[PDB]
Amino acid sequence: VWKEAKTTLFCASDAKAYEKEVHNVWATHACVPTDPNPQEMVLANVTENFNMWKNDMVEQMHEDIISLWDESLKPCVKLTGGSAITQACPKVSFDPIPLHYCAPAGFAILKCNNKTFNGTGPCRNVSTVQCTHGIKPVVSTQLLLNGSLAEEEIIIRSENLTNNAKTIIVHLNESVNIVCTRPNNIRQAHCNINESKWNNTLQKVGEELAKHFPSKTIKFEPSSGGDLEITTHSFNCRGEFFYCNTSDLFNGTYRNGTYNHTGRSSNGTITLQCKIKQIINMWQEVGRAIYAPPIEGEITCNSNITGLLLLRDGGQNDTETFRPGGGDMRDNWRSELYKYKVVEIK
Numbered sequence: 001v002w003k004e005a006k007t008t009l010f011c012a013s014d015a016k017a018y019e020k021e022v023h024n025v026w027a028t029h030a031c032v033p034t035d036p037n038p039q040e041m042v043l044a045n046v047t048e049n050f051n052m053w054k055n056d057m058v059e060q061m062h063e064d065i066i067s068l069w070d071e072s073l074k075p076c077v078k079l080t081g082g083s084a085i086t087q088a089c090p091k092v093s094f095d096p097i098p099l100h101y102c103a104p105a106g107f108a109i110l111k112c113n114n115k116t117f118n119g120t121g122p123c124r125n126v127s128t129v130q131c132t133h134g135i136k137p138v139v140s141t142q143l144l145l146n147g148s149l150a151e152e153e154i155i156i157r158s159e160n161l162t163n164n165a166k167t168i169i170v171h172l173n174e175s176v177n178i179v180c181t182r183p184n185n186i187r188q189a190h191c192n193i194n195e196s197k198w199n200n201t202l203q204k205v206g207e208e209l210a211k212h213f214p215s216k217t218i219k220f221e222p223s224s225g226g227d228l229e230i231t232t233h234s235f236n237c238r239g240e241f242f243y244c245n246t247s248d249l250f251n252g253t254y255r256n257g258t259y260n261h262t263g264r265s266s267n268g269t270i271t272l273q274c275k276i277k278q279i280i281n282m283w284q285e286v287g288r289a290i291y292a293p294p295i296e297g298e299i300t301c302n303s304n305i306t307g308l309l310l311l312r313d314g315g316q317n318d319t320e321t322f323r324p325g326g327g328d329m330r331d332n333w334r335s336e337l338y339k340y341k342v343v344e345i346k
């Protein structure tokens, strides 16, 4: 007595009504308090087909985050195709919160417990809950920040591996720490990553990729070209939009189980030059948004890289190249909603 049906979900959270952070402000009025303790209804001898690439839940989280940003991060100017809108854009407290998406009465959620599950195909080990796990609505490109990790090995997720245009989602099993700071140029910043740990990472990832390719050379290169939001690792820190140059990060070749990288510094750490931008291209809609100059003081963000977004170059020899990607924030949420599927208890 179960199948695949579309329904309108609601969110829950441990948001605090006294906190002036926008994620809390939005949540307390748009979400239900956490259960906060439902239970996993485990199932045996049952197999279902999940498809992280065609899932309503994602579009639903998409609209909410968009709404969340509409109330929270209001641009000074919003230019959309010739027309412009001005409005108050106060500086504010910004720091994402875990968001559990829940199913209404009559419906439930199916959870794949296969720790190797790639996001598509059958799943011989399922379960049941009313709400998903806490998901921080983190908007960023190239690198997935503050997500969950793969409990076992590194998983590679793509709607189609042989179609170089389909986005590759690498789910890391160990997190790489990243620290972006704008020290006391006012719009200048930088992010630090420990090479040795970024090295281990890309080797494991390199191998996991090799297992999906005819032992060709596997090179990593900076994004070919396009908007700054995509050609760079961009994200939001305390309300400020960081655009961090990643050309010293995705720079190395890994063939024959070997690992070789480029762009290091004395302390043995990779540094990324960043700019805090006022003019950005919106991820919510096709339109440009203009914000106020950066606040004062140390603007620093300490995050954990838990996944990558890649893009093979493909082409109609002996060398496959991948470049950082992103842009379509839906991918940022398939990487956390791959475990879930809405079902009708009907």
Ligand SMILES: *[C@@H]1O[C@H](CO)[C@@H](O)[C@H](O)[C@H]1NC(C)=O
Residues within 6 Å of the ligand: 118, 119, 120, 121, 122, 156, 157, 158, 161
């Ligand atoms: C995921 O596993 C399915 C079989 O269950 C397979 O067809 C598909 O190629 C796999 N996807 C990736 C990207 O590993």
Ligand SMILES: *[C@@H]1O[C@H](CO)[C@@H](O)[C@H](O)[C@H]1NC(C)=O
Residues within 6 Å of the ligand: 152, 153, 154, 173, 174, 204, 205, 207, 208
């Ligand atoms: C992390 O995942 C990679 C997948 O390639 C694996 O080689 C490594 O042993 C994993 N570490 C664990 C199991 O903690």
Ligand SMILES: *[C@@H]1O[C@H](CO)[C@@H](O)[C@H](O)[C@H]1NC(C)=O
Residues within 6 Å of the ligand: 160, 161, 162, 163, 164
């Ligand atoms: C994967 O992508 C390739 C290249 O676009 C295409 O020829 C093939 O039909 C796709 N496979 C599936 C399962 O859609």
Ligand SMILES: *[C@@H]1O[C@H](CO)[C@@H](O)[C@H](O)[C@H]1NC(C)=O
Residues within 6 Å of the ligand: 195, 196, 199, 200, 259, 260, 261, 264, 268, 269
């Ligand atoms: C980064 O990776 C290279 C190649 O594996 C390694 O030799 C190097 O020691 C690592 N980082 C540093 C600076 O130790």
Ligand SMILES: *[C@@H]1O[C@H](CO)[C@@H](O)[C@H](O)[C@H]1NC(C)=O
Residues within 6 Å of the ligand: 231, 232, 245, 246, 247
């Ligand atoms: C990143 O920095 C390098 C060296 O300064 C530069 O060549 C490259 O164009 C930068 N990337 C972008 C798109 O800003």
Ligand SMILES: *[C@@H]1O[C@H](CO)[C@@H](O)[C@H](O)[C@H]1NC(C)=O
Residues within 6 Å of the ligand: 220, 221, 222, 247, 248, 251, 262, 263
């Ligand atoms: C890799 O990084 C090095 C060191 O910054 C740089 O000189 C080189 O052009 C980069 N290679 C690319 C862009 O693939």
Ligand SMILES: *[C@@H]1O[C@H](CO)[C@@H](O)[C@H](O)[C@H]1NC(C)=O
Residues within 6 Å of the ligand: 095, 096, 138, 145, 146, 235, 236, 237, 301, 302, 303, 304
């Ligand atoms: C990532 O999570 C940490 C820990 O809560 C937080 O301090 C940091 O601001 C987050 N980074 C981003 C990009 O939101």
Ligand SMILES: *[C@@H]1O[C@H](CO)[C@@H](O)[C@H](O)[C@H]1NC(C)=O
Residues within 6 Å of the ligand: 146, 175, 177, 303, 304
């Ligand atoms: C960041 O990653 C480290 C290392 O795994 C972990 O100890 C810490 O809890 C993480 N912080 C957050 C808030 O994800």
